[PDB]
Amino acid sequence: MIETWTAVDQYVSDVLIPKDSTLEEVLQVNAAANLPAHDVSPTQGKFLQLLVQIQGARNILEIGTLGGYSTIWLARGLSSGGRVVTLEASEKHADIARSNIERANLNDRVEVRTGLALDSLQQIENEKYEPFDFIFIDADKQNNPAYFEWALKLSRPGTVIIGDNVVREGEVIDNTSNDPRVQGIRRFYELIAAEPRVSATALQTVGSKGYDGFIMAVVK
């Protein structure tokens, strides 16, 4: 099945996504730096870019930078004078991400903050940051419950929240699993349901990265 899903994704990108030497280099540098290949796929990246454009987002919060691949897709969807604030725990990942954001000529609208996301989120609250209108949660999924609460806290009515990798090859329905990622993801779904101010759905996806999925939520 992975061969078929990968072939379909190759077809989709070949026809709908013009070759982009900049983004290809980002992945190449990530690999050279030994960063894991956990970036969103090209089709997922374009989905994010287009969703940002549909929302007309101007203040994006991303949790989990890696090498800035998703960050570039997101930043490219920004309105006028919008910006992206992305959080990364690894000093090395963050350094590489900054270099890739530089190679994409987006350093004028993207800020990479190094440190554990929970600590950075508190700092963001402490500082004078306007509410975020688009939030992409893509870090350590075991912490999704806390990231969701922070996302809502730092949101405004109409804010879009995308939570990546929330199906995990179907492990999401294994209620007895002792895996913290699975339990964290399940609590993420539950907390969204508990919040009357948030309405969401989740689509299961397949492609070059395998069988997974994402949550798309909107703050009332």
Next chain:
Amino acid sequence: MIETWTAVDQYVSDVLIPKDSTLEEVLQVNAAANLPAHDVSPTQGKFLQLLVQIQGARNILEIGTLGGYSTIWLARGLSSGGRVVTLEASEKHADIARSNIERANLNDRVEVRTGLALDSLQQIENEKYEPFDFIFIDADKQNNPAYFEWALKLSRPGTVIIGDNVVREGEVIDNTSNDPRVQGIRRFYELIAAEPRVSATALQTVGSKGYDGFIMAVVK
């Protein structure tokens, strides 16, 4: 396999989509009337509703009504004096859709036009309809090329176009397919690539309806 995808969708729906007796009735009536089970899934329907809300769409065009299941999800995403115009070739389907839409108390927001979509689209242009901000193509896929051209013609900068069922169990990559629906979808991808005014991506999805996918495009 399909068992896992179905179970995951059941989980997602159970937690994120509150029970809706109105929509349950809609599907029951569609089935009693022997309509094919081609309605979007509940999670796909909510995805459409949320996307409509994110864009803040006010004038929706849907091609392919069936029993009005997707139509209701779309209409529920509207707010002010928003409207939905949906096209259906089957007189029987159209009347069942009008009935379901009425039971959902949305007849004031939805217009179901009976007839071949290509004929109705010409009429819509002839008439003074305002440009459509959101277009859902979900009828006979062999005609997607023509529907895409009409969508572009009746759009405005920023219009969102969603094309459903564009992966079809992975057959979309088979250029030699004897399925006119597969050829129609391939023609659709190609035309999008040939239209500079449209940027798109496609995500492959799995769930209760099986392995398929959708295209999301934005008009520039």
